[PDB]
Design a protein around this ligand. Structure first.
Ligand SMILES: Nc1ncnc2c1ncn2[C@@H]1O[C@H](COP(=O)(O)CP(=O)(O)O)[C@@H](O)[C@H]1O
Ligand SMILES: Nc1ncnc2c1ncn2[C@@H]1O[C@H](COP(=O)(O)CP(=O)(O)O)[C@@H](O)[C@H]1O
Lengths: 365, 373
């Protein structure tokens, strides 16, 4: 069986690393010299606006998936008529636009921040009038790592936020500021028949809008049950196949959906070394029409390497640390790898402190 | 850092799968179409007898290793004048020839089968006269998965064995049958300084001369200590860098060396899913000059897929089984994949029984001899 992946970045790289032992063959649409190239059969560089060329490429294979939900859902629909793509064009359309995403949650009784579509300064003033400060003005599309956002903390900031973000061609959303204690994510995988394999919750640490740490299992049965029930709604309504990621704000026993990603996600990277079947192996099993792997998990912390990464010789000296370099060119803010560590004892805690020392030296956000 | 591997088969494939997350780049010398191709940066097909061309290929990279010790040690010596190769040409020269291997062990007081170099029928008759039947005649070089052997049980078998094997250009060895209870292997990895990371013993089951199952950790403190001491001697004598495998026959509390392989080995494949750092990741760390990874292990069974392999859908349905297909075309006796399973509870034991049933349906071994004792 041949699997095509739209994108040749680190998610594609890790999908192939996980799926290749299953005896599957991987092909990417992307740039030669992107980091998945050395671990897949072929990489083909086709401009995504050339729909017919993309469809022709995809038809060479048995099933297609993608690493970035910002791609055209109309493109996915065109491919999916000729060869299966998972997950769905609907999941892409909804997840890639903050307003559509929030409206979808609202329609299905799923809690989120209060939100308003913003198409003018007057509309923004009304939103602040209706829903209050503090608040965040965000681009509806293409935001990542907290980019394209302006936190409004005063009346004065309203005009300032509008002036900064008004020219976003795909529009803007007002979000009420959520007072939460911490953040967690639910990753799960759904197969062709709608069966879902759940991972435990992971608690995620952010700095300057970028995830820097993720730790699982976050043990809280009330929260886990709520997160699973939300995931079940999304899987059903999207007719979803593959790994799905849901990010939440937590306030006490209350879960508030922040956003979703219809793909393997940074907050599940711990599962490479902490679950019987990682989020990557399970995404591949799902789309390949295979039964999902067991997801029994053990305590694991994942640390991101942003803007740089410690020298391999220094990492290797911490002999329990599992190294995941993506072999990417370092640049400010760029995710170039991560480190996983199972946490069982004091030696593990020591190695974790050492990893943190090294990351402090290499990080550039 | 760029690592060149001589060979593009499943061992190279698994070295790259293990080493690529460390940020290392892999290149193979082998045939395009070989199973490592899809997981390495490049594969280059050069005839190994073309020494200058091989050396030129190797000099592109920062360190070289190899997946098959049957290659020319003189080739490795030539490469190593200009780019580091691990492990050493000495390890290759000794390990690749059954007579040199046995003689090395004998010279270091390490127990082996009784053995005799066989270069004529008369020499074989004398070996039988001196050491008895049953016995095995084996090629000194190129043997693997039991190939190049003839088990001698009767007087009439003596001439047959000689006639089947006598054309081997690199000669033959007689071995007396060893009285043993079961077989274990010691896999370990040595770094540039001489530190050794040890795996627990694995207990290995063979059928018709090919390994079919491997289970670790095999707990026996007395045997494990003896195996480690033997490994230490070999690492020191070979100035060894990389993963090393030693196969033993066990009789009570005694270890008899069967043979060694200067490489990752089939009996260590369990470590992909049963150790903190697999034999493959550790081989890569060793040759790359890195500190070795922790080898803390958990109970795991490895089952080989020979000839054929069960359908992926059937394997995936046993949801704790870890699938390692090499993506190789089925052929009688060919190793086309393996399966690993951690064993902690009754559900694991159930999945183990079910996966063994699937393997019994897919297996096609190319057996040539029976080794019952
Ligand atoms: N409505 C809100 N109220 C409070 N904090 C928020 C918020 N929206 C986002 N944040 C904070 O800013 C971080 C990044 O926000 P987003 O998840 O919207 C940015 P991105 O990951 O899509 O690029 C969140 O993880 C959260 O800590
Ligand atoms: N001298 C001996 N006495 C008894 N059994 C032997 C033996 N030599 C080999 N065997 C049996 O045949 C199996 C394969 O033999 P080898 O290890 O020599 C074959 P290979 O792996 O080098 O191709 C051994 O694992 C062992 O079960």
């Amino acid at each position: 069986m041949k699997i095509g992946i739209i994108g040749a970045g680190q998610l594609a790289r890790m999908l192939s690393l996980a799926g290749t032992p299953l005896g599957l063959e991987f092909h990417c649409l992307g740039k030669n010299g992107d980091c998945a190239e050395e671990v897949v059969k072929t990489v083909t560089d086709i401009e995504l606006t050339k729909v017919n060329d993309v469809v022709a490429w995809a038809k060479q294979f048995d099933v297609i998936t993608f690493e970035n939900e910002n791609i055209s859902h109309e493109l996915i629909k065109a491919i999916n008529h000729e060869v299966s793509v998972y997950p769905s064009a609907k999941a892409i359309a909804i997840s890639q636009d903050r307003l559509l995403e929030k409206s979808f949650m609202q329609d299905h009784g799923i809690a989120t921040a209060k939100f308003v579509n913003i198409d003018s300064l007057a509309k923004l003033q009304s939103a602040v009038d209706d829903h209050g400060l503090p608040a965040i003005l965000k681009t509806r599309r293409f935001g990542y790592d907290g980019k394209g956002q302006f936190v409004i903390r005063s009346q004065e900031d309203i005009t300032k936020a509008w002036d900064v973000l008004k020219d976003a061609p795909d529009g803007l959303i007002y979000e009420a500021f959520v007072d939460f204690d911490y953040e967690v994510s639910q990753i799960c995988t759904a197969d062709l028949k709608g069966n879902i394999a759940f991972y435990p919750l992971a608690r995620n640490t952010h700095k300057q809008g970028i995830i820097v740490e993720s730790e699982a299992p976050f043990e809280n049965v009330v929260l886990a049950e709520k997160a699973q029930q939300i995931a079940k709604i999304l899987v059903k309504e999207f007719a979803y196949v593959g790994t799905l990621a849901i990010e939440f704000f937590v306030k006490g026993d209350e879960l508030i959906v922040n956003e979703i990603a219809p793909r393997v996600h940074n907050s599940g990277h711990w599962s490479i070394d902490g679950a019987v079947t990682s989020q990557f192996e399970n995404h591949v099993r799902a789309i390949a029409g295979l039964i999902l792997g067991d997801t029994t998990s053990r305590k694991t912390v994942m640390l991101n390497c942003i803007g740089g990464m410690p020298a391999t010789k220094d990492l290797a000296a911490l002999d329990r640390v599992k190294i995941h370099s993506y072999n990417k060119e370092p640049r400010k803010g760029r995710k170039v790898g991560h480190l996983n560590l199972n946490l069982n004892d004091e030696t593990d805690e020591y190695q974790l402190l050492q990893v943190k020392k090294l990351i402090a030296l290499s990080e550039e956000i």
